Design a protein around this ligand. Sequence first.
Ligand SMILES: Cc1cc2nc3c(=O)[nH]c(=O)nc-3n(C[C@H](O)[C@H](O)[C@H](O)COP(=O)(O)OP(=O)(O)OC[C@H]3O[C@@H](n4cnc5c(N)ncnc54)[C@H](O)[C@@H]3O)c2cc1C
Ligand SMILES: Cc1cc2nc3c(=O)[nH]c(=O)nc-3n(C[C@H](O)[C@H](O)[C@H](O)COP(=O)(O)OP(=O)(O)OC[C@H]3O[C@@H](n4cnc5c(N)ncnc54)[C@H](O)[C@@H]3O)c2cc1C
Ligand SMILES: [Mg+2]
Ligand SMILES: [Mg+2]
Ligand SMILES: [Mg+2]
Ligand SMILES: [Mg+2]
Ligand SMILES: [Mg+2]
Ligand SMILES: [Mg+2]
Ligand SMILES: [Mg+2]
Ligand SMILES: [Mg+2]
Ligand SMILES: [Mg+2]
Ligand SMILES: [Mg+2]
Lengths: 463, 470
Amino acid sequence: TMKVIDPQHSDKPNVLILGSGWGAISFLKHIDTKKYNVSIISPRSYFLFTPLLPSAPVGTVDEKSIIEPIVNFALKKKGNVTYYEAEATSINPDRNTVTIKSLSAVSQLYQPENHLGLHQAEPAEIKYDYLISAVGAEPNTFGIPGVTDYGHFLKEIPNSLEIRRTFAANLEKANLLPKGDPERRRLLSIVVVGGGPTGVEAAGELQDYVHQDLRKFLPALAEEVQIHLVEALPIVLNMFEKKLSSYAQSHLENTSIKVHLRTAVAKVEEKQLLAKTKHEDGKITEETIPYGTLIWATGNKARPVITDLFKKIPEQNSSKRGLAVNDFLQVKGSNNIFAIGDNAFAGLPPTAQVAHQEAEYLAKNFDKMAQIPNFQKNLLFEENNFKPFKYNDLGALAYLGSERAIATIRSGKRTFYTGGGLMTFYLWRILYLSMILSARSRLKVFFDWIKLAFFKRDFFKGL
Amino acid sequence: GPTSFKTMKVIDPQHSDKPNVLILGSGWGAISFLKHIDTKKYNVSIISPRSYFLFTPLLPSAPVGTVDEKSIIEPIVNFALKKKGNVTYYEAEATSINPDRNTVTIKSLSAVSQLYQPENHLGLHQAEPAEIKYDYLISAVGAEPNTFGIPGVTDYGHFLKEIPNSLEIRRTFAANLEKANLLPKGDPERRRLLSIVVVGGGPTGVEAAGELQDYVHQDLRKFLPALAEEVQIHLVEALPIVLNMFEKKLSSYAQSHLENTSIKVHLRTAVAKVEEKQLLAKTKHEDGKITEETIPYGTLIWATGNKARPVITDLFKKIPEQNSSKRGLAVNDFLQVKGSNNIFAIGDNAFAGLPPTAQVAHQEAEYLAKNFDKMAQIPNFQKIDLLFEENNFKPFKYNDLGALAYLGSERAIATIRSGKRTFYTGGGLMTFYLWRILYLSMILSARSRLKVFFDWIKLAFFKRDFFKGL
Ligand SMILES: Cc1cc2nc3c(=O)[nH]c(=O)nc-3n(C[C@H](O)[C@H](O)[C@H](O)COP(=O)(O)OP(=O)(O)OC[C@H]3O[C@@H](n4cnc5c(N)ncnc54)[C@H](O)[C@@H]3O)c2cc1C
Ligand SMILES: Cc1cc2nc3c(=O)[nH]c(=O)nc-3n(C[C@H](O)[C@H](O)[C@H](O)COP(=O)(O)OP(=O)(O)OC[C@H]3O[C@@H](n4cnc5c(N)ncnc54)[C@H](O)[C@@H]3O)c2cc1C
Ligand SMILES: [Mg+2]
Ligand SMILES: [Mg+2]
Ligand SMILES: [Mg+2]
Ligand SMILES: [Mg+2]
Ligand SMILES: [Mg+2]
Ligand SMILES: [Mg+2]
Ligand SMILES: [Mg+2]
Ligand SMILES: [Mg+2]
Ligand SMILES: [Mg+2]
Ligand SMILES: [Mg+2]
């Protein structure tokens, strides 16, 4: 016997959102809670502004500054929003329910607050009239041994804390060791795997901490740290014009970062890893790299609750990366479930930028559906001349450490800005600050950057 | 046996002629001292297991995010950087003070930071014991929370002394709110989970309760009004009045206000024992009779006095003049540990008849540092207790500057004075603004001061950050 939550107080349809990230929150911001009853299931009680996560480990920004509680977005809604802090473990399409487990809390932001009768660590099924799936994707080790055990992903707030604690602990042991000790040099050694903007910014941020703050009180130690940027492709930041990639690499190397291109990690052990380089000519070299801190910033794979769903919907069996959706962001094989963000595959890159646009688009569709009597009761999309989702690539930005960035801003076929440099770094800051989804988070990031102009970064081992 | 290889690494810097001053701790005493000590005349080293200074008077507002944990601490290294000479910081714990050989034993060594060029390799290892040699010792390790022998307080309650306590209190209460809200209204377990007991009617307990009541009334109530209405905060105090260091009328003003905010105050009440989900409170009434009440609670905050640390009580036994000590090291007019001519003690680890406050610790420190300025001009100092009388050093003289207490809901009481003169004494709205301005001014670092300021500004626009595990 499973507890089934199925709210039929009003005729408003029950919209059930999975997740509290870019897709789910952008959707929540735009959905009409006067026309729809909205519920959210996510094990993370806050929205995470991912593009600034790479600057959290070293305190360029603080962890709290870049997150925003779901409840704060929920308060600004006019209707009834319920937030289940729990994890969706099974999507059950044929009975229109989602199974949740690891239930920690339930928050009903409205008057009635009918007692639901759920208990922590007790399974349950939430019923829905529409499902919006946005659970994202999870880090992909690519089958490389040791990465889970010995490295750190850069995906969630706890990763920021773990990275800081590992590196801080390493600096402390290293400094006790005599200069010239290879163990000391290992402990001051950082490997970042992934040459996309995330890996690049992580390395640039760590290099900034070392050069700007650490060096103020432990210059010799700071001089010995070596940061390594490992990338499997022939260039870093390959979504950018090649000349910007070249600018970025030269700058990174100028800040003393070592870049290993055409290089892949073959295996990871506790104190060292094996890197193989596939040269242009075709030969393969390998290097054992001792490291103290390994940051794994690359690849993402479908979550288990999503790959399980693949098997329950015939049209979805051939899916591998994410849920196949139609022009309308409807999961194929379903007329009830929509998917947006990294958990959907529609040919688009996996970015917040795409997730945010899908969401705003879908929410607007939900405005139209609520004016068409048939949708409530009962192809409807084609018939009512809904327009397909159309992604508008607005561009890309990457911080490179030491107050330089690259950026390309566009819309449609028009490029409005494309280059790198000092001013580009100020643009990076302004643009990111303007993309943040909440006034509070925006103010906190702003205060963090102001403090940074006067004082060193907070780098507390365990705080 | 006498054949033992017993070998202990001993750090004895004899590079320069400057005397080695060794400071124990990184709190009010140690840091105020560090700020004033002349590092051109003296070589300074610091031993403390805490790598940062903690601005204690704002700790009670950390658990609920009125101010953030990071905002009220400042890394030792930041104070050390502003010094002109050589400062070394041992992140480790002093476990034995060895007066007859002028050394301090350290353990749990995590790190050593030498903020100067030579940086001679010392050859220490983590989790390896060592002894640091000194020409002068400044002991300021403070005091630790006292459970008074009451069973269960350590196991089931939370102290309010250090940053980790702030985190634990938040996590306990936040977890309780979540469980409580799943329970149906009227369930006694729900009512227990929303129940908070603060033991200690001094400014620390009062502010802790006031801050929690603020979080509940201002922020929690915004999104969970029914839950917020059900929380009950209890202030338990063994004396007949709260805040007994204040004028009695201010105490009465404070209690009435606390009770207005819905805090329940139990005076003349002492906790006899603490179990996991409940505690036993006994009230000794004026007439002489004793009543007892079992109080179910979800969160217990224990803010009542402290006691001497083990490394201090061990020292009691090694110095004949100090055997009769119980609360702290007995010092003379010059803050010299009696029975010693080498060791000075300031802060809560010393007993000189003064109250145990940051206010006293800070003044002892500035005073001692100034003495060290004088000693460095008198060739002979380079026995000692006489030199002080002889060279007409003045005894330490504490100047009580007053007291403040925040009471929740933007009210405070305060009495500001100097000597026999009272410059301010009362309570209310403006007193709360004074509380803020005065505390902001008392903070020891520009960084911490800016962060607290930003925290209070954010507070005017947004709810407090109350993350269960962050
Ligand atoms: C460090 C970093 C930096 C990035 N920088 C950029 C950038 O600069 N520009 C850009 O365009 N993109 C950037 N991205 C990519 C962007 O973050 C993702 O594409 C975006 O997260 C996709 O949005 P989403 O809603 O699909 O998933 P997410 O934002 O990851 O949200 C997923 C949500 O689902 C929740 N969840 C997980 N499992 C379950 C479950 N079983 N049940 C219910 N909920 C669950 C998660 O807790 C989370 O709340 C960055 C990503 C990272 C990691
Ligand atoms: C919550 C709270 C609020 C307070 N509010 C006020 C107030 O508003 N006004 C006021 O006047 N007073 C206040 N106080 C009291 C004030 O904080 C203390 O009197 C002050 O700490 C005494 O200074 P100290 O240097 O002796 O000890 P502390 O400031 O506590 O410093 C002790 C230092 O010693 C370190 N240490 C501990 N053990 C060892 C060891 N074995 N070896 C080396 N180092 C060690 C500790 O880490 C710490 O760094 C408050 C105290 C608390 C707990
Ligand atoms: Mg999402
Ligand atoms: Mg997110
Ligand atoms: Mg509302
Ligand atoms: Mg998704
Ligand atoms: Mg994702
Ligand atoms: Mg490691
Ligand atoms: Mg101290
Ligand atoms: Mg302190
Ligand atoms: Mg103390
Ligand atoms: Mg002391």
